[model samples]
Target: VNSFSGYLKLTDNVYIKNADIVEEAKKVKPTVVVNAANVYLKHGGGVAGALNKATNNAMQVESDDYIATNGPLKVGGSCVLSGHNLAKHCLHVVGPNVNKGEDIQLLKSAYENFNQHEVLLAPLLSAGIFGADPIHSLRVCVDTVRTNVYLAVFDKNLYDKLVSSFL
Candidate 1:
């Protein structure tokens, strides 16, 4: 987990990595955890999958409850699931997808409307199955977040591809 510790410095309160963000998020007591969500707010896979597992499915149940109350979420929109384990809450956001012809700002809006926090443990928005460039996602994330952020991701190569961009 400390493999990137050699150079994990923050650029204006932002840190990027390929390691487990949720694991690290535990140490810092993140104000809230940000998740890449689908319009349905499903927690079937990716960060949301592991997040639900981590919280004993509490996040999943909460997400379901939110959908029942608010209907499906929209692109560039967000919803919150009150936490059971990890942080005090989980912020689920719908991001843009090139496959859908949506652009970066939609992804940017995903993070922009966040209800600011002290330490935000976030994941790469729309970079994997959604078909957005990982580097561009990182750029939009760092450029948009105004609070302390640990931009953690699971993509195996991003830790290397992005280390150069971090400094």
Candidate 2:
């Protein structure tokens, strides 16, 4: 685990960890873990798929039920699933597509919606299969979140790059 001061003083409580998001969640035991969901709430690939598997497919079921009852989540919108496997709450957020150039704004919106949970766990939004720049996404996350945030990084090279930037 590595900690970095943010661009400003208040958002300085940001961390990068070389671990699976689920493992990070288990260790940190955050009040909420953010899931990078598609607008349709499909947890089929990338970080979402890993999270679904980690939760024993419970997140998929909960997301399906949520969409069935509340309709599809809009871009930059979110919903929460309580009593998830890793955290007390799972905050599912619809991130934007980088190819469309809305990823940065949407990522900021997602973090802004975190509602000040005491400790929040998040993956690099739109930076995996969605193809956004990880560094830029990390900046947006640090800028938007008001509470302590943990960012789980699976790739060693990516983790090194992020750490180097902070240093």
Candidate 3:
């Protein structure tokens, strides 16, 4: 499957190397830090295809070069993918797991911490490959925003559209 890369970063100096992606990330750093062990993302392949169709062809999960990132360990977890390089490292802090009812709460905590500058960067709940299924993930992301927690989503085209939408 083609995973979205909106959750990764390069200059941030942090990357999420889990059990699955640890080998890949090792090319850059050996002692990859892991946190939030209980986190999990429900990977529904159908949802990605559905969102692309629902959005009037504006989105799809066909593994685009524009969708580039290094972590999320394996494709299917909910993480944001954004960075300076074409395909840099993804910092996976184990945000709230999918449908856990606590997902939104964890996101809020991250948001609050991020605002305090405790963490240089944090992934938007509904961005990255997860955002490919925005209908499903946006709810968690919206809830975070409702609490005044700011998060960013990166997809070259939609990234532009999002900026334009606000302006």
Candidate 4:
């Protein structure tokens, strides 16, 4: 019988061409290991943008059960706020989109509220969508919201004027 309970190594790379993440995830025997990637865009299958607060909460809850009942888990999604999902127990994040500043903050707040068990980890940043070469996007997000735990930088690419209007 095949059981999802073994050690698996998730590679640390951002370029999609480098590895087939979703595919490789299927091959692991039991223990699913996830490495850190720059970004994980769930495109083609109507995957756009990132998972919202509600969805993220559900994913984390399910992932925790899967890991606890099955085997250890590893996360190989982007370092971006909305990418990492299979981290088990904690939902590490940066920020989603970066354009929806308040929306991102709301998401953070939602996570904070639901994170009574310390399931949602903090001090994480968003992964870049442009390219891995410019992985500094996480830094920009961290700098923007380091003070307020509920604050998040949405759509960092937008001009300050546009962002100010929202602020």
Candidate 5:
């Protein structure tokens, strides 16, 4: 999660590459950075970890504060909090694991439930530790996203495939 730019315009509203989401968000300064957050809104690892590190834990502090007052985000639901450093705001969404029967549907819900933004920077929802197939997750996101989206991918192979898929 280090590159500053690897832009590949897949459509009028989408782009994807091996770009770091947090850094990209800062450089592009989107309306929000859509974090692939845990159900408890913890910013412990994955893409959330990078955001936490960049903001020096302020992101986590804000998340904890939000959950403390608002309750934990339900699976397939979203909550918004301060971006701290990466973007104007940080939008957190919890997608489902692959084992559940409604995994895809829930992933769709997570993708669609968030509030709109002019520009949204996101990682592939549920594709990493959450166990949803990367391709399926990407498709769900691409199908549902309405705002201008820039997808920051980490895996080189997935990045390669995204380029291949678009070409």
Candidate 6:
């Protein structure tokens, strides 16, 4: 992926990398860090875990509050939290759990909902513990957010695979 200069040039604004998401968040200082979240606001797994640790669990508290007031988030719905550690804000979205053909729509909704921000840091939606295709999700993310976007991947093998397919 590094060798191919055109690879990172997927779009004028979209940038993808196989690096620690928290590290990337530190470097970019994105206006918002978006992650897939469940109804309970649990941050014990996947990218949610990393964001929870990065923010020293502040996100969990905000999410809990949001859930308490708003109830469980519907699919494709989102909530925004003030960032505590690295990012300035955090965007939590309830992503698809199964292939009902609404994954892309939900991801697009999340992106559009957060479009006010200049830069966004996000993971491949539904691609980790939720069990969706990483490549397909990446495409949807890039296609939806046509501005400054940093797509982070923690696994080197999956990164290589995505780079090969997209580059």
Q: Per-residue CA lDDT of candidate 5, range 25-127, in tens?
A: 8787777788888878788888888889999998888888888988888889888788777888888888885654445678888988543666678898887
Candidate 5 segments whose C-alpha is farther than 4 A from its true place: 1-6, 99-102
For each candidate, what TM-score against the reference?
Answer: 0.84, 0.85, 0.30, 0.23, 0.87, 0.84
Model 3 residue runs over 4 Å out of place are 1-92, 97-105, 116-119, 131-153
In lDDT terms, how accurate is model 5?
0.78
Q: How many residue pairs collide in each prediction?
A: 0, 0, 9, 13, 0, 0
Superposed by TM-score, candidate 3 places the C-alpha of residue 82 at a distance from the truth, in angstroms, of 18
Candidate 1's TM-score = 0.84
Candidate 3: give the clashing pairs: 5-81, 6-80, 6-81, 6-82, 7-80, 7-81, 7-82, 8-81, 8-82
Tell me which residue pairs clash in candidate 5. none
Error of 5 at 126 (Å): 0.7
TM-score of candidate 5 relative to the true fold = 0.87
lDDT of candidate 1 over 1-167, digit per residue (tens): 32224225557567766667667556544667788778887778777787778878877788888789889988998876775667777778888867778876798888775636666677878877678988888788777878767777776577778776653
Candidate 6 residues lying further than 4 Å off, grouped into runs, are 1-7, 99-105
- lDDT for model 3 comes to 0.31
How well does candidate 5 score on lDDT at residue 157? 82
Task: Point out where model 4 deviates above 4 Å.
Answer: 1-17, 29-95, 102-125, 128-134, 137-167
Candidate 3 residue 8 Cα shift, in angstroms, is 19
Output the better candidate (3/5) by TM-score.
5
The whole-model C-alpha lDDT of candidate 6 against the native structure comes to 0.73
Candidate 6 structure quality by residue, lDDT tens digits, 1-167: 22212225467778777777787777767678887776577888888888888888888888888778878877767777776786788888767755555554566665565466677777877778866778887787777776676778889999889988984
Task: Give lDDT for model 1.
Answer: 0.73
* lDDT of candidate 2 over 1-167, digit per residue (tens): 32332212224677767777877676656678888888888989888898888888888888888889988887788888863768788888777877666646667786677645766778877878877889887888777777777777889899878877863
Better of 3 and 4 by TM-score: 3
